[PDB]
Structure formats: C-alpha cells, structure tokens
Protein: AmbP3
Amino acid sequence: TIVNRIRTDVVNVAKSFGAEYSEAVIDQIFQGFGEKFTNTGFAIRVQNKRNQKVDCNIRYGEAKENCLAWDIARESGLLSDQGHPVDTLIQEMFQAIPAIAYGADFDINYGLVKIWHLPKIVPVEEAFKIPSLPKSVNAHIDFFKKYHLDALCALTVDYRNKSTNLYFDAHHPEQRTTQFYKNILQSQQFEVPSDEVLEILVNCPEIAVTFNWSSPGIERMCFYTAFVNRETVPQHINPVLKKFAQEAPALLDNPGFLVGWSFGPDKGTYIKIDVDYHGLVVPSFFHMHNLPL
Ligand SMILES: [C-]#[N+][C@@H]1[C@@H]2c3c[nH]c4cccc(c34)C(C)(C)[C@H]2CC[C@]1(C)C=C
Ligand SMILES: CC(C)=CCSP(=O)(O)OP(=O)(O)O
Structure:
C-alpha cells in the first residue's frame, strides 16, 4: 500500500539521518493521519536545528476550508489541552479568516507539533483581530509595514514550541534585493548569512515570522525557496541539503524540494528541507505565490 510505503520511507529517513524517533509516536500519527498522507500534499522534512543532530518532521496540507486536522487530532488524542493561549488559537484563526487550505506537522519523536491555516492572500491587518495571538504580533505593525510584510499567506500554531508564525507572500520589489535580507535580519540582530545564501534568498517567495508569549521580540524568521528537482538544490551549501536532496524518498524519481532558511539570535539559524513526496507541494507553492510552475 501507499500508506505502508510512506511509513517505511519515513522510518528509513529517520534511520539514515540518525534522527530521534518513537515507533509508538509514529503508530499514533499514522493511525490518525496515514490515509491523509497518502492522498494530499505530504512531505518529509529533515532539519538541523540542534547541534550535530538532524530532526525529522512529516507534514501534509490539503485544500479544505475547515481545519480537519484539528478535529482528527483532538478526537485521536494527538492534540490535548495545553493550558495555554494556543488552546483556542487555531479555532480563532479559522473563525476570523476564511481558509482555502489547512495542514499539520508532526515530529516523529513527539507527535503533532503544528497546525496551519492557509487563506487566500489577505492584508496582514486581518490577523490583528485574532484574540489569542501573542501581543508582540500587533506590536510589530510598523515592522511588517516597513519590510513589506503586508500580504499574509499563512498562519501556523506550534503547540510544542508555544509559538505562532505569520507567513507573507514576498511580492515586493525590495524583497528582490540582498540588502533587504541583510536589513531585515540586522533589525533583529540576527546572523547575516554568506553572499551566496543571500543570492538565494532574493528569490524566496515566502517569509515566515515567529512570535511567542515569552518575549516581546521576534523569535526567528524563515525564508522559503523551492527547487524543481534534486540537482537544483544548493547541495554544496550544507551536507544535509546534499544528502537529503540525493537520497530523500518520493513516489516520483526526481521530486522537487522546499528549503527553509531559518535565522535567529544565536540558536534559530539553520536549514530545513522538505521532499515533495507526491509531486503536489511544489506546484502548490508556486501557484499559491502567483508564480509560473
Ligand atoms: C505549498 N504549500 C503548502 C505548504 C507550504 C507552504 N510553504 C511551505 C514551505 C515548506 C513546506 C511546506 C510549505 C509544506 C510541505 C508544509 C506545504 C504543504 C502543502 C500546502 C499546505 C498547500 C496545500
Ligand atoms: C509554510 C506552511 C504555512 C506550513 C509550514 S509550517 P513551518 O515549517 O514554517 O514551521 P517552523 O517555523 O519551521 O517550525
């Protein structure tokens, strides 16, 4: 079956990359969501957040108007009460902004980590009326304006990290210059990457900003870049990129990949890479940012 092939590929990724994982957690996740993984925008992610350690997440999105993952996880026990503002945040999001898609993210050592909300691109102001958002979000209004973070294309709730992300379509011409990325990173006293990386960031169609309930500042931000196949991934920049690009499983022979370039105070600076397991994620990314496939 597809679902068994997916589960096998996921375990094999975790073994090959030495990622921590729990067979019992994988069982919970697949009992809840394995069918969803066979039928929708599924991806396997590795990232190198922690020191000399790769973590593995599995994720999916589908074009439903309602947050089916929240219902499945609550009914399944994969999502329990947190005693925290995250408890209702997803619900608020779907009540406050119409959704054209949803998705969910799972750490295979843990369980459900995040749920997300994909509306049509709307002005970021529509987020400020979500009650349970951390206060730092509405406090960054002038920040969003200045850096052309006006076109909100997604929201995520991170139940494990106790954080939320706002995602922006990076449509503005200034976001086509490297000085934009040096500026936006410097404004938070984040690490500035090499010139080559910056030359990669100028093409990014999507910028994520992470807020939390423990500081008034931005926790991290992330720049997403898609690549149509294994070869066009900048494999020379980091060994995890090379290895995952060359060895990641998919139901296609030469699948595409989504690379997130994350930046923070220094931790927060690292790479994430997702394999387009079914071939749907990358055309979705381009289409959702009004770009030719
Ligand atoms: C395209 N797409 C959306 C997501 C997405 C947006 N940006 C990303 C950067 C990195 C990774 C992903 C995404 C994932 C794999 C989570 C995508 C899954 C399909 C979505 C939900 C559309 C139906
Ligand atoms: C990008 C779409 C909205 C869902 C992906 S959630 P993410 O990978 O950006 O979340 P992290 O900040 O990396 O934990």
The longest strand covers residues 55-62. The pocket of Hapalindole U (ligand 1) is lined by residues 41, 43, 59, 61, 63, 101, 103, 118, 206, 224, 258, 260, 274, 281, 284-285, 288 (CB under 6 Å). The radius of gyration is 18 Å.
